[PDB]
Design a protein around this ligand. Structure first.
Ligand SMILES: Nc1ncnc2c1ncn2[C@@H]1O[C@H](COP(=O)(O)OP(=O)(O)O)[C@@H](O)[C@H]1O
Ligand SMILES: Nc1ncnc2c1ncn2[C@@H]1O[C@H](COP(=O)(O)OP(=O)(O)O)[C@@H](O)[C@H]1O
Ligand SMILES: Cc1ccc(-c2ccccc2-c2nnn[nH]2)cc1
Ligand SMILES: Cc1ccc(-c2ccccc2-c2nnn[nH]2)cc1
Ligand SMILES: Cc1ccc(-c2ccccc2-c2nnn[nH]2)cc1
Ligand SMILES: Cc1ccc(-c2ccccc2-c2nnn[nH]2)cc1
Ligand SMILES: [K+]
Ligand SMILES: [K+]
Lengths: 325, 325
């Protein structure tokens, strides 16, 4: 293949700590972060190309997998073609290409999922798919956070330093997604469980909302769907979904407790697999991607996603996310 | 040491399944189970003697450890000294010695804990203590269940076949221990949290109450103590402890949720260690034995004990126990 890709495929990624990113938030500082972004993005793309190069041959040949592999190759070429950024006039043109990188192929995850599905007969290990997709989703989230933060540092949005909210309220972001999920749930069933929020309802701290924007509506949909499917005989009299916020120095805990009947013993070892579902762009919602994506996201952010199933009663879902400090 | 002990130290234990025990429940059947008990108890004792023989020399020399090792040796001799049971008149005398085995040295666990504490400087691994005590507590529970079930098969107690309750109500046994724990909690603080029980409150099924008689008051004490210690400023206005019963075909789930502030991040990897406590006969209550003993018990019964800490808010404790069928 291409030798420029070979040069950085093994080069370790360099990450700016969220603490270092709030520290910078600008004229002279933007130049330093700009040069950094320029050295970093081709490395992230090269890492993904190495992923495709490492797939078993039979899987890497899948025309959809091959097409996605090609998209990554073309993306790397465009990023390395740009000369070193000297003046802010070039950075505006480079932002047009980072915006183009971010906008042109947002459906890569969907394409990969299709490619891996078409290749299932040649995949003996469910571990290979989970490992490949976990890496794909986390690296694409890292690329998205890296790029979107640099682009947002141009803007003067209140309570934000790039993509970092200086005073995020978990109650507010949960409420925003509760309203979204309830409206969709009411459209399907003619009713939706009421959502009660308790615990540290006044908590506010520096945090990045972007991954919560994927995780929260997914977990809310899961809890609401399980509640409605469990109470189809009394659809206008369903138990509440209860959300607890626990805020301490180390982490933020969001517990989502439903009375949806639980996750059956037979399904428990399968719910964390991609494509496993009992229901009938970027990271996709639906088709059994919800739980594995949310877990890959939480773990990449230094936290976790844990489930406690009470078969016959309901499920408690624990989302833990590490504080910025 | 003694050659009779050597003969059965490696002989695999033979366990009667709880299903097989309800199946038998008597004149002719008692003889079959009686002969079985006779072949089995010396094997269980020999296994414990092998545990002492296998301890590092420096630990096995501890005079308290040595004394407990001796008690096991003397117990084995008494069990093998008895001739094969022919008539039920001898079984009455053998029950007097099983009752003597069960009554004379109920404080063995306490003595072992003292011996291992005195030997801490020569113990490099906390894993050695956890592994030794887990094995000691589970094997002593197995010996107690084996012996007490055979002795109880003589009695005609309603709703029981030996130690197996044919229609145990988890709500009833939880309520019994709630009343016990509340009275003790009121004596220490002048108040106790109210305990609410919800979920499958009408569940009744075959089960063995004996291990729940250790686990439930321990977990209730933990939840009540954490709640009172967290609300010392308002001791007569404390949040309720909420217990959920979930009954399905596979297992029984008892979730104990408190608003006791949680288990601190610094203590989380230590709460499951013997002697770890922040508070200031058979299996002992107190001195940091609660959680490791309850977990060893739940796992030995085919279930588990899992904790979810919400630091700043409270803790959810999940006790899972496998159904008899
Ligand atoms: N709260 C819940 N209660 C019951 N079942 C659930 C719950 N959350 C998830 N599940 C189960 O896990 C499966 C996988 O969930 P998920 O990965 O989010 O995918 P999807 O939402 O597309 O079905 C669901 O289809 C459902 O069977
Ligand atoms: N529900 C709970 N909430 C808060 N802390 C708890 C809870 N349960 C247990 N702990 C912590 O775990 C420690 C160990 O518990 P345990 O093994 O039962 O021993 P002990 O009850 O003798 O202290 C407790 O001292 C306490 O610090
Ligand atoms: C583990 C980790 C998670 C997120 C961040 C991050 C935050 C804000 C903006 C960008 C990034 C980022 N940069 N590179 N990869 N992620 C850095 C490390
Ligand atoms: C290489 C690349 C990575 C992320 C994006 C992206 C942009 C906006 C919104 C979502 C995503 C996304 N997330 N995961 N996959 N794509 C686009 C291109
Ligand atoms: C894993 C397991 C747990 C309990 C029992 C048991 C039940 C009732 C009475 C006795 C015993 C018993 N016999 N031997 N060891 N435990 C058997 C197996
Ligand atoms: C060898 C032996 C095993 C268990 C008992 C016992 C009896 C009654 C109540 C509790 C216990 C007990 N449980 N764990 N350790 N001792 C007594 C002797
Ligand atoms: K899934
Ligand atoms: K402990």
């Amino acid at each position: 293949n291409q030798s420029a890709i070979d040069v950085v495929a093994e080069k370790p990624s360099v990450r700016l700590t969220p603490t270092m990113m709030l520290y910078s938030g600008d004229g002279s500082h933007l130049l330093k972060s700009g040069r950094y972004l320029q050295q970093e993005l081709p490395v992230r793309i090269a890492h993904r190309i190495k992923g495709f190069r490492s797939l078993p041959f039979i899987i890497g040949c899948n025309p959809t997998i091959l097409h996605v592999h090609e998209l990554y190759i073309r993306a790397f070429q465009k990023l390395t073609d740009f000369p070193p950024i000297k003046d802010q006039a070039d950075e505006a043109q480079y932002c047009q290409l980072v915006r183009q990188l971010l906008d042109d192929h947002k459906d890569v995850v969907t394409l990969l999922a299709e490619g891996l599905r078409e290749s299932r007969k040649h995949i003996e290990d469910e571990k290979l798919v989970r490992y490949f997709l976990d890496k794909t989703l986390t690296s694409r989230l890292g690329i998205r956070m890296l790029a979107t933060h640099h682009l947002a540092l141009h803007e003067d949005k209140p309570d934000f330093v790039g993509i970092i909210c200086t005073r995020l309220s978990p109650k507010k972001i949960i409420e925003k997604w509760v309203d979204f999920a309830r409206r969709l749930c009411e459209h399907k069933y003619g009713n939706a469980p009421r959502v009660r929020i308790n615990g540290h309802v006044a908590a506010r701290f520096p945090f990045i909302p972007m991954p919560l924007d994927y995780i929260l509506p997914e977990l809310l949909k899961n809890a609401m769907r399980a509640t409605m499917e469990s109470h189809l005989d009394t659809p206008y009299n369903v138990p509440d979904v209860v959300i607890t916020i626990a805020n301490n120095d180390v982490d933020l805990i969001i517990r989502i407790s439903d009375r949806g009947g639980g996750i059956a013993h037979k399904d428990l070892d399968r719910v964390m697999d991609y494509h496993f579902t009992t229901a009938e762009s970027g990271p996709m919602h639906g088709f059994g991607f919800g739980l594995p994506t949310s877990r890959a996201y939480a773990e990449y952010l230094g936290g976790s996603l844990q489930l406690q199933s009470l078969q016959g009663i309901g499920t408690d879902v624990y989302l833990r996310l590490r504080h910025i400090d």
